Chain length 504, copies 2
């Protein structure tokens, strides 16, 4: 390629060794064209074969643990202990989808029992199943370089679904992505499958991502990042001659409601709060960004404990220069406003200071520019006049990944009113706990109403994430020999199937 | 301002004036709908199921009025309308069963594990809930089953979403009567009228304001690609983009092998009957037939041609649809590379038409792939099977794809199917695409333009999921969890635990 670029050492701001190519529409077209060419064969593989591929990728990842961790550590400044845990998460996530595919449940086989002798017209034999949309484009998250990136949840679920994947490598961690790509390449060689099943593209020129999202052979997109770029790419996906599904997690402030009784039951609630908002130096998509509380002594004590803890926080090294500068200018800018109080920790640039904002519900209603997310070790506390004031505020919240509630049995009557409101604005409700942890299981819902997600009827994490890359096809009166195995009368795959409305 | 329906047979106005609603009524309707959204999705499944059954009953009680009125507004024969009323009513009952079933909840739960290290596994449970108020645009060609109380309205209500219908200007009187039925059903069930609102108007600003209203959370649409895509774009430019489920059109490609033509001497007759059903005004009408260059095909073409010449004049749904049909068929028959056979007809009636061309010419005119709504269809004679397969690789999205063959063709059919799966929502074998069974396995839609959301169906039990989104609940106490997710499963619904089938 005409140009190359280097990763930035997260700790020094200087370039790290190893040059990466700056791909353009030329490579996009080649990758997409090749991906399209193997799409059909890939979705028609036996479930066990595709399941094996996912397990092999998981294994290859673990075999390169050292390289990944060392490289990702310098590119992102995330501690090694965290990266070691993320590698495992990533690997187990791949295995989870391996089980799903092998399971055959994703087929969602459904069949109507024919009825030749019904009048006036006979009831035909109809059977439907899910199949892969085709090549899928993936943009990884900068804050989770492994579990939400090259081999993250979007890639994993898309491959499981039977969709070839093309990753637009994030410029914040090119070296990490490349190693992951080397792992997937090896997995494909061992499984003896086409390399075009997975392609990693690199480049620091936005034209790349734009060309990838607009390519006619791309049939869906997975994205994790900022609302600005995320919405721009989303719009691009819907202006195409053929609009394609766009699953992007754009941001959230994850509203948290804390009742007085909860603060009494847990003396260290403030400590727990500060630990949640400062985890990963506050760089969690699920970070509790705003806390609504009642105007009682408990809250004042709570605020004071949190404040004291915030002052003691060690300097934080964020993910990218850009993310650092946005954080610095935004917190300083918000703390300048009237009606808001801010407590900062001690920190010298390039490091950033943790912050805790405090304001009243009146001012919260007055400054609508406060519901916006500020990515970093920062959070806001909104002191409300009473519970009714608190419920009123929940009615106006924007979409969020999560919504948390801290209460005891004596609050249940009001909590009962709050839940229906939170269900409407969040993808996941957390009770007497914190939103940061995200369990990769079967019941997970990671996403929610806009901006939490650009497709609230889905999840980017959990077994159900696979459905985002599938579409149903009905088969009418086809002979047994022409029907896909999943829909044959004898059910040779022995998968769960729903007949005439009865549970599978 | 007011407007009148047009008599489909005369072009003159029919009695009864209808209001021309604007953004003012849109805001009122949407605001009221939003106000009852929460209570509506929180009703017991049996209550909402009952509402759907009552609507079905009220519709049947007004059968006479609906048929008489719809007949004059659309020119569709009474026998057809009588059958559509039943379809509509049974469709509502189908969703009544689904709701009552509790299956739409898709309850899923992860078994917690307090003692796992390093970190414990939380108790997580998820279910589907209504998106909120939904906007619906009915189809002009199916004034009952795809309109005011059609599949979108029925599945949306079943899902727990209030519905606001932008009445189609081609059948205002029909819609109003249906709205009177739903109004009565809501009174009997003693539920808020804002659960369902019918808006009327011949000014496009109405539909645009409805699709753009911030309280509207999803849209159901059946109609032209032009208007459909325009409203779709509106839906995605909103500060908050909303799902848009629109069926915009299709040519429903049909592949016929020589052996099939030999096995059914009357295959040509069957074809002509399928393309002329409802005077060709079916969304699933076989619009293009690919065949091999053999004597069988020549005989086939000649039989079809002869039948086409005998077809009685057709009265289309409205004048606009009539004129588009007339100018488009006359315009297409004007290409050198296309032969056309017309039936005898005098305006306002239209003539049926059968176009014939070679695969070579088909490759030269990509526009021939565009749908011409009316009693017309095209036959493309191919050099051989390989030529036929090559053509299938370039087809645009379609609702259906049909194949006519016998065992001796299975080897080539085996290659064709994977190609057709990619471009169609429903594959039909040795039959015709026109009929659409309202069951559980149905998939009515498909890749664009067949649908603007290929991962869904606008007909069938699964249509309900278009109006639902999942919510996860973590560590909530039993008393605060919705019934569908309580530990004891009081609703006795199917639920999936840790990956095991529900
Ligand atoms: O992570 P983060 O918080 O830093 O979030 P972010 O700015 O939204 O970046 C997430 C990903 O999307 C890419 N991206 C953002 N908007 C883009 C646009 N409009 N055109 C093409 N690519 C775009 C980024 O490219 P870069 O890698 O070029 O930032 C990155 O790979
Ligand atoms: O039935 P058909 O074949 O005649 O199809 P169609 O033109 O697509 O009409 C289907 C429905 O959509 C409405 N519509 C179409 N495009 C519109 C636009 N861009 N803005 C607002 N409303 C729009 C129509 O309004 P009208 O009833 O005004 O045609 C009708 O109710």
């Amino acid at each position: 390629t005409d140009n190359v670029f280097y990763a930035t050492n997260a700790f020094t701001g200087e370039a790290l060794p190893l040059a990466f190519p700056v791909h353009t529409e030329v490579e996009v077209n080649q990758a997409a064209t090749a991906a399209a060419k193997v799409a059909r064969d890939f979705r028609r593989l036996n479930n066990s074969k595709r399941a094996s591929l996912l397990r092999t990728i998981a294994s290859e990842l673990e075999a390169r643990s050292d390289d990944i961790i060392a490289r990702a550590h310098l590119e992102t400044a995330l501690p090694e202990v965290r990266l070691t845990g993320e590698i495992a998460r990533t690997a187990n996530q791949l295995r989870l989808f391996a089980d799903v595919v092998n399971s055959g449940s994703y087929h969602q086989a459904i069949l109507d029992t024919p009825n030749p002798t019904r009048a006036p017209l006979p009831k035909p034999d109809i059977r439907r199943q899910q199949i892969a949309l085709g090549p899928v484009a993936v943009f990884g998250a900068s804050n989770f370089p492994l579990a939400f990136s090259a081999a993250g949840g979007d890639t994993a679920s898309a491959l499981a679904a039977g969709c070839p994947v093309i990753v637009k490598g994030h410029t914040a961690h090119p070296g990490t992505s490349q190693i992951v790509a080397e792992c997937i390449e090896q997995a494909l060689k061992q499984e003896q499958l086409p390399q075009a099943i997975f392609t990693l593209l690199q480049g620091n020129q936005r034209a790349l991502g734009q060309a990838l999202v607009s390519h006619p052979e791309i049939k869906a997109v997975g994205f994790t990042g900022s609302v600005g770029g995320g919405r721009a790419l989303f719009n691009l996906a819907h202006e195409r001659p053929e609009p394609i599904p766009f699953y992007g997690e754009l941001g959230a402030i994850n509203p948290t409601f804390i009742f007085p009784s909860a603060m009494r039951a847990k003396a260290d609630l403030a400590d727990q709060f500060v630990a949640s908002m400062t985890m990963g130096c506050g760089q969690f998509c699920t970070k509790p960004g705003v806390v609504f509380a009642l105007n009682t002594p408990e809250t004042q004590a709570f605020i004071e404990t949190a404040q004291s803890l915030i002052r003691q926080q060690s300097p934080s090294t964020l993910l990218t220069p850009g993310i650092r500068d946005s954080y610095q200018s935004q917190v300083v800018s918000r703390g300048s406003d009237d009606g808001i109080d801010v407590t900062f920790s001690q920190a010298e640039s390039p490091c950033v200071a943790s912050a805790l904002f405090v304001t009243s519900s009146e001012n919260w209603r007055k400054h609508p520019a406060w519901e916006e997310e500020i990515f970093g070790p920062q959070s806001l506390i909104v002191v409300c006049e009473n519970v009714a004031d608190m419920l009123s505020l929940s009615e106006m919240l924007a979409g969020s990944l999560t919504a948390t509630i801290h209460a005891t049995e004596e609050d249940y009557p009001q909590v009962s009113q709050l839940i229906p409101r939170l269900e409407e604005i969040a993808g996941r409700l957390v009770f007497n706990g914190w939103p940061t942890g995200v369990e990769v299981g079967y019941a997970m819902v990671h996403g929610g109403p806009y901006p939490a997600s650009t497709h609230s009827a889905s999840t980017s994490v959990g077994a159900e994430a696979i459905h985002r890359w599938l579409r149903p096809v009905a088969y009418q009166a086809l002979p047994e020999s022409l029907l896909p195995d999943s829909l044959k009368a004898e059910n040779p795959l022995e998968i769960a199937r729903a007949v005439d409305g009865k549970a599978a």
